[PDB]
């Protein structure tokens, strides 16, 4: 019988407003970005990046990002998030054999929560869009190498790339939010 506060508006239906959806997406993305920064730190205070997602071309300056069509921004956020599920799976398996293990499991879970929301928002504004294949890190076996050094460099590349992509995902979601609703 009861409904949520905002459904207290004329439209006969009752869907979550687009504004509320973008709010939730940017705060989840903000959270993953904090976690990634934490892993980057803890790892640098105890032990050239060539990220596998570099093949996905992105706008890296303000002029160009602001000019990007909304259809392409969505596509870039969704494939970047899809691309990290496997590498994280492999990392978590290695670290399972302290703190790293715990944040790795959380970011992997929240990245899946976040892509779900980004697909819902995308299908709401552009019905019938389809998402294409995303890149793979083939050298991900190095995270379990018996050689101590090659292993340390594997994790270095992993946390720093994870930090950079969390940051792009969050900036692109803020741009779309400011453009399609309210900043």
């Amino acid at each position: 019988a009861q409904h949520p506060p905002y459904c207290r508006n004329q439209p006969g239906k009752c869907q979550i407003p687009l504004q509320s959806l973008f709010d939730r997406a940017t705060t989840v993305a903000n959270y993953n970005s904090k976690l990634a920064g934490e892993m980057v730190n803890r790892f640098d205070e105890q032990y050239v990046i060539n990220c596998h997602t570099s093949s996905i071309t992105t706008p890296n300056s303000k002029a160009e990002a602001i000019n990007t069509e909304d259809k392409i921004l969505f596509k870039l956020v969704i494939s970047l998030l899809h691309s990290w599920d496997e590498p994280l799976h492999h990392a978590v398996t290695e670290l399972a054999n302290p703190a790293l293990l715990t944040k790795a499991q959380e970011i992997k879970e929240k990245a899946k929560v976040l892509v779900d929301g980004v697909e819902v928002i995308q299908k709401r504004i552009h019905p019938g869009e389809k998402n294409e294949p995303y890149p793979v890190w083939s050298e991900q076996s190095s995270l379990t190498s018996q050689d101590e050094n090659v292993r340390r460099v594997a994790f270095y590349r992993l946390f720093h790339c994870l930090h950079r992509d969390s940051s792009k995902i969050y900036t692109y979601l803020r741009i779309l939010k400011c453009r399609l609703t309210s900043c």
């Binding site: 019988a1 009861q2 949520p4 459904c7 009752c14 939730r24 779900d116 929301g117």
Partner: protein
């Protein structure tokens, strides 16, 4: 007719709905505002009698759930947004320190607004602050103090557990 009593979520990751007998086997079904597929309660056990528990596998903050209880005579359909039914845990790490002389009260969360009280109690809405100053209290008395918190669009958490402190004689 059966009626839905209340649904609650402690962390936006899982939630539980409770109901009250109609007058009989009780079942609970739902659907999402999005699609036209119907579903049945995924668990009548872990939350005790007359309830339905939704684990992480069945909880989403991206859609509205349309819930209805049946008795064999449906109930009035209920609309749920997991982000508006959060009822947290009391604030934690409550510390009290004496500092002319005022009581410095400090806590940590379990954004949120807060409320502290000290003795028939003197309530103090504190907003988003996580520290609070209280002046002009009685010298030579033990004081009881508790805290509460509430999400952006939630329900109040129960009162924390008492902490005491004594104002200099």
């Amino acid at each position: 007719k059966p009626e839905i009593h209340k649904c609650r979520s402690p962390d936006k990751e899982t939630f539980t709905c409770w109901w009250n007998p109609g007058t009989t086997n009780y079942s609970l079904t739902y659907s999402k505002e999005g699609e036209k597929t119907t579903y049945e309660c995924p668990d009548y056990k872990t939350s005790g009698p007359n309830s339905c528990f939704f684990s992480k596998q069945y909880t989403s903050i991206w859609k509205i759930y349309i819930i209805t209880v049946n008795a064999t005579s449906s109930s009035d359909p209920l609309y749920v947004d997991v982000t508006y039914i959060v009822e947290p845990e009391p604030p934690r790490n409550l510390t009290l320190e004496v500092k002319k002389t005022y009581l410095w009260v400090k806590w940590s969360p379990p954004t949120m607004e807060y409320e502290i009280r000290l003795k028939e109690w003197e309530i103090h809405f504190t907003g988003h602050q996580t520290q609070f100053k209280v002046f002009d209290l009685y010298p030579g008395q033990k004081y009881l103090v508790q805290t509460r918190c509430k999400p952006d669009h939630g329900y109040w958490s129960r009162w924390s557990q008492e902490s005491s402190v004594e104002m200099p004689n």
